[PDB]
Design a protein around this ligand. Structure first.
Ligand SMILES: *Cc1cc2c(cc1C)nc1c(=O)[nH]c(=O)nc-1n2C[C@H](O)[C@H](O)[C@H](O)COP(=O)(O)OP(=O)(O)OC[C@H]1O[C@@H](n2cnc3c(N)ncnc32)[C@H](O)[C@@H]1O
Ligand SMILES: *Cc1cc2c(cc1C)nc1c(=O)[nH]c(=O)nc-1n2C[C@H](O)[C@H](O)[C@H](O)COP(=O)(O)OP(=O)(O)OC[C@H]1O[C@@H](n2cnc3c(N)ncnc32)[C@H](O)[C@@H]1O
Ligand SMILES: CCCCCCCCCCCC[N+](C)(C)[O-]
Ligand SMILES: CCCCCCCCCCCC[N+](C)(C)[O-]
Lengths: 494, 497
């Protein structure tokens, strides 16, 4: 008994399922896996209490997920940043404060500052709405992030940090991704400072008890309406009602469909009539990134006694993990260090066993933190999202050179009675649980409008700022704004 | 009755289905569409007699498809190249002979000759077998064709021809594709001259009566064994026998499976257990190209009376088609001009209607050939492969930067009892009907060897050269081999100063 069938049981699909349900429509969520959540997964066991193996951090400006979470009963806590962060470079650890690791060489400094600034400068020229309408869309999209970096960075030290920055943001290589798309990505989160910041940015907080809780609690509000172990394999739009068919043979009929699965994963559904050419091809050109999330558990948060907060930014090819955060529960309990094994390394180290990875991570953390204690883990958890069939990767989808301009506007164009959600279709914090909410609700409202229940006026809604997580605005030093680039200085002579 | 289930009813799947069948095994071909052939499709109707709307040309060195075709009863005929070809550049038409349009400016000449030569030089370093083992695999793979071209080409005239060359070979933009992969592609066909040549190259000949005939005639040899309208949707390897399930609900059980569908199209099958991480992700990173094949029929082969053979190479953004060949049947009958609408243009002009495209093609062919007669088409056929669900595109699969080195060796690595065919897994003329044969048969022989019926020794077989289409070898002028590059000349005169 269905007005709308939502494909996809993740935050986006649930967010949508709920909005429709709240508005008095009969919905149904068909979910392939034996669990809701998708790219969020909260493991619960005795050694760990709870742990986010998937999507986890939420921050200021991410108002939608914060709102939906509150209403569903959930609370946040601050990720630990009281003590010092560590930038570990060329085999040595240098402690620091603030978002960016400091650089002492005045030339290198000019270069670094210019890089971050130019990402943001370039970004101001790309609309979130429609990145392909950027004045230099063609040029920028026809060129990789590695190219742009090779051009923009006069120092090896800045090329390397920039690379790490790209690797960490989108779990792909700089040579894999289009410049236009990457620049769009960063800007639709609020620029470099917002995206890279723990305190006052994207990694500020986590949900008490896990984020799996979000889509779980929505499943509760919907009773028997969410159907687990139901992978959709066929959508048929020939008749008056849309027929949607699952791998186990059940048939569902609906006036409308929200597809809230990752773009490329539409490949997994057979369509009748065939999809329009643009979409048929678009969905083969949009891969997801590669990451292993790893958590190592320790008797005590030892790092803090050495005045380290747990954050490590680790340069170099040999290091299996480039970025860590402290994962100790808000109490002091269950101390842990979180880390990502990114991009090409997620492929290299997947060859090893669970134990061999644990060993490599510990030896690293031991070197970086300079403490024997890191060699004594009390427990370990990991997830390699590269092997998930109904995910395709993590965190999100990336666009190779040339594809955003050409196939861009396809992603959220309705196909008859199919409407498209999922975070990759958001316009603010796309890539994140936030985007998942934006997209989920907009797609729902699109259907509402088609049924003539709300005006076009009302499809895209703005969101009131959170009271519990107010957003400090981002500011820049006069010197930051005005210092020359390395070439610019060379030009200030001859 | 199933020892091996073949998914994929195209030339590769059939080539395979037959090899196994001839060796006394019970096979089954499960095919999604209501026809075999796949990326070959031969339209038959009264206005046209027959027309290849899909894969069509065969040439010297393409011995496998040539052999399989002969044994199946088929014959070839030469594509028309008797008269002059046309290079149409900056609004004007310049007739010429030989494979390459001539260039007169001595500087530009050096640049052009060096470009073609360097494609081939770089290629000699890449193993067909395993392109990712090239000495400079990382560097080359991390970089797009547009990048390599921007670096290699000192003249705009050469950048443009090189771009067209890329567009035409792989139906993609230079900025879309990895340099390593592209250089591999060209070299596994026999280098630039072989790939671009009509006479004595890849476009020498067509099959009399169509190429759909190839897989069709194999369907005949197999009786009721090919099951049309059967799209596979689930493969299950948990048990002793592999279960394969179709969209209409039928179950098939087999000791082994050949998947002979385009790599990325495996996405369309749900697996149990899940695929290994590498494949699972590989198959999202491997798109197919974009092309519309367009044939315009005329009362007579009028071009020939003007001493033009029908070949047009057309530079420039405004032209909807960059390359045409003469499609007149070997008799003189049903005169026609064949042309491709490539890459980004395939997306742009799909917006228009059948008639609007015809008009644009006619106006172009009229300008290029300089004859009002082109404005008077007697009939028109077209296929836009971009809209094919069970194809994904045409002609073949292309690799974006970074993917070949990382995900390369995954393409033809067995997954338990699944073995992988399809042309994208060939090593000689991959991308082509030839490749489809190579890969089909190798896959089949892989299974044969797993059952201990033939030695490992015998999985990859070499192929005797055709008697009807012998291969003239490729040669180069002394001057071609030794003329400086543009930079090389700049160097050569900076050693007087
Ligand atoms: C995995 C990853 C993601 C991630 C992260 C770290 C990693 C390791 N860290 C994050 C961070 O800390 N902050 C944040 O905001 N997000 C972070 N994420 C990204 C985040 O997980 C995603 O942005 C978000 O969860 C996306 O949600 P969405 O709903 O848009 O996509 P999904 O979660 O994958 O849900 C899709 C559901 O659809 C089901 N599915 C797939 N195919 C089918 C078929 N064919 N039939 C029926 N159902 C299907 C999937 O199973 C899934 O449940
Ligand atoms: C389309 C294109 C191709 C082409 C060409 C021009 C264009 C417009 N010109 C060529 C040229 O002149 N010379 C040449 O040698 N080849 C040319 N081609 C390329 C050529 O067609 C291909 O290289 C070759 O045909 C590839 O064959 P292969 O067998 O390897 O791949 P396929 O033909 O697509 O066959 C696949 C079959 O599998 C079926 N399928 C797909 N999905 C499923 C599922 N899920 N279940 C069951 N069956 C499935 C497809 O329908 C297809 O029949
Ligand atoms: C200049 C420091 C180098 C970059 C530091 C910022 C780390 C980026 C964190 C992005 C993590 C994204 N995600 C999904 C894990 O939240
Ligand atoms: C230097 C002339 C410009 C390139 C001319 C060669 C045309 C390449 C033909 C490739 C066609 C491939 N295919 C599949 C249609 O056979």
């Amino acid at each position: 008994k269905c007005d709308v069938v939502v494909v996809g049981g993740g935050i986006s699909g649930m967010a949508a399922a709920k909005l429709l349900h709240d508005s008095g429509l009969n919905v149904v969520v068909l979910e392939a896996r034996d669990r809701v959540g998708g790219r969020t997964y909260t493991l619960r066991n005795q050694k760990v209490k709870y742990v986010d193996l998937g999507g986890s951090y939420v921050g200021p400006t991410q108002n939608r997920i914060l709102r939906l979470a509150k209403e569903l009963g959930l609370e946040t806590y601050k990720v630990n940043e009281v003590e010092r962060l560590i930038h570990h470079v060329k085999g040595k650890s240098y402690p620091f404060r603030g978002p960016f690791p400091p650089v002492w060489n005045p030339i290198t400094y000019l270069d670094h500052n210019n890089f971050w600034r130019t990402m943001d400068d370039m970004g101001r020229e790309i609309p979130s709405d429609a990145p392909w309408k950027a004045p230099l869309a063609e040029e920028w999209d026809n060129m990789t992030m590695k190219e742009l970096l090779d051009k923009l960075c006069w120092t090896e030290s800045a090329k390397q940090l920039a690379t790490l920055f790209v690797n960490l943001c989108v779990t792909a290589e700089t040579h894999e991704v289009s410049a236009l798309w990457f620049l769009w990505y960063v800007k639709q989160c609020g620029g470099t400072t917002r995206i890279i910041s723990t305190t006052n940015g994207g990694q500020e907080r986590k949900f008490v008890g896990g984020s799996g809780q979000v889509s779980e609690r929505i499943m509760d509000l919907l009773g028997d309406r969410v159907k687990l172990e139901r992978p959709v394999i066929y959508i048929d739009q020939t008749r008056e009602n849309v027929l949607v068919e699952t791998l186990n043979h059940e048939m569902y009929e609906a006036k409308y469909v929200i597809s809230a699965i990752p773009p490329t994963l539409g490949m997994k559904i057979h369509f009748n009539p065939p999809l329009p050419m643009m979409r048929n091809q678009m969905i083969t050109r949009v891969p997801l990134g590669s990451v292993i999330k790893c958590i190592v558990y320790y008797k005590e948060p030892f790092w803090r006694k050495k005045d380290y907060c747990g954050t490590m930014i680790i340069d170099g090819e040999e290091a299996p993990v480039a970025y860590t955060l402290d994962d100790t529960k808000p109490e002091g309990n269950y101390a842990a260090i979180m880390g990502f094994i990114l991009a090409h390394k997620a492929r290299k180290l997947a060859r090893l066993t669970k134990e061999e990875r644990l060993k490599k991570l510990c030896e690293l953390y031991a070197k970086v933190l300079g403490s024997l204690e890191a060699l004594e883990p009390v427990h370990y958890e990991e997830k390699n999202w590269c092997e998930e069939q109904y995910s395709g990767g993590c965190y999100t989808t990336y666009f190779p050179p040339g594809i955003l301009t050409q196939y861009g506007r396809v992603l959220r164009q309705p196909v008859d009675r199919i409407y498209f959600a999922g975070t990759e279709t958001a316009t603010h914090w796309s890539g994140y649980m936030e985007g998942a909410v934006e997209a989920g609700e907009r797609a729902a409202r699109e259907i509402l409008h088609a049924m003539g229940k709300i005006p076009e006026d009302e499809i895209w809604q703005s969101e009131p700022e959170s009271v519990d997580v107010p957003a400090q605005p981002i500011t820049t030093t006069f010197l930051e704004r005005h210092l020359p680039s390395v070439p610019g200085l060379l030009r200030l002579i001859g």
